[PDB]
């Protein structure tokens, strides 16, 4: 019966739990406590992008770790060159609601999404000239919070619809969708292999999705609150999450648990952005007191600061190369700190 | 100038750009942007037919002043996760039904979505223009419905301008930001013709009020 | 993506004409357009540049002050008006679009031209071969030198190779000195280390018989060469 199903689900979970718990011997905190520390770590803002005249919602780099694009509730998606603050691009949005952009590994794409429940992709590298709506897919009933790119014909999304799909491009269709979440996905990661992903909803938990079957493997909890961003580790293996309980927390795959929290009494305020540095030792997270914190991966302690921004740090990247970090703030301004 | 030729047509691209977004900048500040979030569905197709997917954007004229309208209400999710990109809107466009304090009680859960709404850290200074919608339905049910139904207390009698005024000054108390805002309220109908002028009106009144906080007088 | 042209015939000399090229299928306004000349027998040379919004115009040597170009871009049409044309004005004036961005392609497309015959401080590039005789299949390196180094201090070097088959307009083949132009088979190749550059043709085909061009973009008197003519 009913009863005796959910009798079976809280059983199997304080399985699952023991299994954790066994297979937790040690705490990363007491293996990384004889290595070094990281050292007082100092960034300033090489530059400074001007121009949008809203809130930064969503940013993220090309693969050639100079160019970038920018979301704006303005309507206007820009493109960046980095090394020179100039425009490269700049998209006119039908909908003014952007709450995502990803640039294509190739490059030839960008896609940006909002409360349109749709993130239409942007055909860059074509002739005419002028940046066109290659495909507007829509399927989903919610806000579309993340939306990432595989390959140049696949994109996963990530919808308040509690519910992330993967598109076929060309088709316009919903080849898989994942479903198994039960608040609104607000984040989601590709790994560097790009055969599966994490994506983080509201309900304080992280769900790990293969991208062939279509089925999660793996559930991840211990966020009192909704998480807003998710990353992976660059080694492929752990990932990230950032929650409005001012914590960042590492959770890892192989063993499926977490390995550290990283939270301070003096932090209260969400964390809207998480990103991970090149060799993954910085976790740099975006915070709502207007500060970017620079944290340590092997051990809680914090290396640094990027005081820099006089609204909420919405959107927080690390370039491919991992040279810089360009932070994303409502007050209008992506600036980039090395 | 250490810049290639291409380097400096490249600029030159972005000095257009720079240009074209501060026009399309501009013509946007000179956009008025209403938030309308009405409890439940009722009052919500009256008014937009009135004045003239996530969001339903309309975009309107009067007295050449250009508002822009959104229809949020068919999200479907969590509204804090994105009540905040409306942070800014010039005003919040509020419609409570007045025929369903028969109909928890409808009004009840409309008060709950003002306490929501009007008491949210991201509209504190962000003014709403509540409407008060189906007149007639409300004129015909209370002479045979009491108030008592929705509001248990009231000491007035079953005269239609008193029970209106109450349901009015209820909704007035639910804010508790009395001075940064203000709540403006139009007892309404679908047979209104006047509802665009008073939209007039108070977006006008808001714009004025928030250019003399800007301003420095108040 | 067209650009046709019109204007050109027979003009006698000190006389004027207005050069018109209609702009279809593309942003014209977006698109700095260009305008290159072609001597019955000789190579390219590049007469004057209109940049997007008229901002940047610049003129060579030859036509400055006695040519004037401008656009209209709600009418999508270039104008080259010149007065006071000498016989040396007799040419294939092309109309030639390119877009300046990071990672743009410019000189990608060339329009037909039009024929105009007149009644009777600058990185000279040198291709010291004017003719190499080629059997389909095999593989050539057509060499280009510059005079002063094309290699700019933000890494790219500037060379822009050019195919002008018999009886058609050029077309891009490699810009930036390794960058395949779009729809250009992966067959051509291009490689160079400042003031000498070499393209190379694996598999060459008939479509490949022509002459082929350097242009430098470094400076902007824009300076082409005597054209490489590859025959079977």
């Known amino acids: 019966e009913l009863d005796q199903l959910r009798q079976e689900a809280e059983q199997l979970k304080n399985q699952i739990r023991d299994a954790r718990k066994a297979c937790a011997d040690a705490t990363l905190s007491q293996i990384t406590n004889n290595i070094d520390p990281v050292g007082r770590i100092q960034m300033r803002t090489r530059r400074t992008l001007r121009g949008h005249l809203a809130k930064i919602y969503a940013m993220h780099w090309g693969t050639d770790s100079r160019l970038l694009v920018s979301a704006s509730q303005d309507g206007k998606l820009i493109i960046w060159d980095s090394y020179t603050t100039n425009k490269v691009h700049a998209i006119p949005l039908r909908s003014s609601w952007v709450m995502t952009c990803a640039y294509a590994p190739s490059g030839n794409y960008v896609a940006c999404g909002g409360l349109d429940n749709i993130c239409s992709i942007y055909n860059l590298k074509t002739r005419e000239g002028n940046v066109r709506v290659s495909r507007e897919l829509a399927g989903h009933t919610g806000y579309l919070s993340c939306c990432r790119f595989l390959d140049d014909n696949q994109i996963v999304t990530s919808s308040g619809d509690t519910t992330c799909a993967l598109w076929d491009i060309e088709t316009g269709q919903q080849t898989t969708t994942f479903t198994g979440h039960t608040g609104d996905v607000m984040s989601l990661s590709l790994a560097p292999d790009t055969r599966l992903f994490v994506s983080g909803a509201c309900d304080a938990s992280a769900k790990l999705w293969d991208v062939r079957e279509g089925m999660c493997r793996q559930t991840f909890t211990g966020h009192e609150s909704d998480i807003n961003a998710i990353c992976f580790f660059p080694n492929g293996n752990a990932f990230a999450t950032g929650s409005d309980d001012a914590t960042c927390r590492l959770f890892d795959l192989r063993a499926d648990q977490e390995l550290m929290t990283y939270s301070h009494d003096n932090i209260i305020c969400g964390i809207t952005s998480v990103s991970f540095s090149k060799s993954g030792r910085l976790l740099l997270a975006g915070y709502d007191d207007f500060n970017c914190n620079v944290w340590d991966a092997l051990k809680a302690d914090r290396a640094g600061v990027l005081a820099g921004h006089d609204n909420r740090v919405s959107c927080l990247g690390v370039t491919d190369d991992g040279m810089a970090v360009a932070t994303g703030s409502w007050d209008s301004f992506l600036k980039i700190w090395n | 100038c250490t810049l290639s030729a291409e380097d400096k047509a490249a600029v030159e691209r972005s000095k257009m750009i720079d240009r074209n977004l501060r026009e399309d900048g501009e013509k946007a500040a000179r956009e008025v942007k209403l938030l309308l979030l009405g409890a439940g569905e009722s009052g919500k197709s009256t008014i937009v037919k009135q004045m003239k997917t996530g969001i339903v954007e309309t975009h309107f004229t009067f007295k050449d002043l250009h508002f822009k309208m959104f229809d949020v209400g068919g999200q479907r999710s969590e509204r804090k996760k994105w009540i905040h990109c409306f942070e800014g809107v010039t005003a919040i466009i509020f419609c409570v039904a007045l025929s369903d304090y028969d109909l928890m009680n409808r009004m009840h859960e409309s008060m709950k979505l003002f306490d929501s709404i009007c008491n949210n850290k991201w509209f504190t200074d962000t003014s709403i223009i509540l409407f008060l919608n189906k007149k007639d339905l409300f004129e015909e049910k209370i002479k045979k419905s009491p108030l008592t139904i929705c509001y248990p207390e009231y000491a007035g009698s079953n005269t239609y301008e008193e029970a209106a005024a109450y349901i009015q000054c209820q909704f007035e108390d639910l804010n508790k930001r009395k001075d940064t805002k203000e709540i403006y309220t139009h007892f309404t109908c679908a047979t209104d013709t006047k509802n665009v002028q008073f939209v007039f009106d108070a977006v006008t009144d808001v714009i004025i009020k928030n250019n003399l906080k800007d301003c420095g007088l108040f | 993506v067209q650009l046709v042209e019109s204007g050109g015939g027979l003009v006698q000399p000190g006389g004027s004409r207005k050069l018109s090229c209609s702009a279809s299928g593309f942003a014209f306004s977006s698109f700095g357009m260009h305008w290159v000349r072609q001597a019955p027998e000789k190579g390219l040379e590049w007469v004057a540049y209109?940049?997007?919004?008229?901002?940047?115009?610049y003129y060579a040597d030859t036509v400055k002050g006695r040519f004037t170009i401008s656009r209209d871009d709600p009418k999508n049409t270039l104008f080259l008006q010149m007065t006071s044309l000498r016989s040396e004005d007799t040419a294939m004036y092309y109309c030639?679009?390119?877009?300046?961005?990071?990672?743009?392609?410019?000189?990608?497309?060339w329009g037909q031209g039009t024929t105009l015959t007149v009644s009777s401080s600058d990185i000279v590039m040198t291709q010291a071969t004017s003719s190499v005789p080629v059997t389909p299949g095999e593989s050539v390196s057509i060499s280009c030198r510059s005079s002063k180094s094309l290699l700019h201090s933000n890494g790219n070097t500037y060379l822009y190779w050019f195919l002008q088959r018999p009886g058609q307009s050029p077309q891009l083949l490699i810009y930036?000195?390794?960058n395949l132009a779009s729809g250009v088979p992966d067959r051509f190749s291009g490689s160079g280390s400042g003031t000498a550059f070499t393209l190379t043709i694996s598999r060459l085909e008939a479509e490949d018989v022509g002459v082929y061009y350097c242009?430098?973009?470094?400076?902007?008197?824009?300076?082409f060469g005597a054209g490489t003519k590859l025959e079977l």
């Open positions: 930036r000195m390794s």
């Open positions: 030639v679009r390119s877009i300046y961005y990071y990672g743009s392609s410019p000189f990608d497309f």
């Open positions: 209109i940049s997007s919004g008229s901002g940047t115009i």
């Open positions: 242009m430098q973009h470094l400076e902007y008197p824009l300076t």
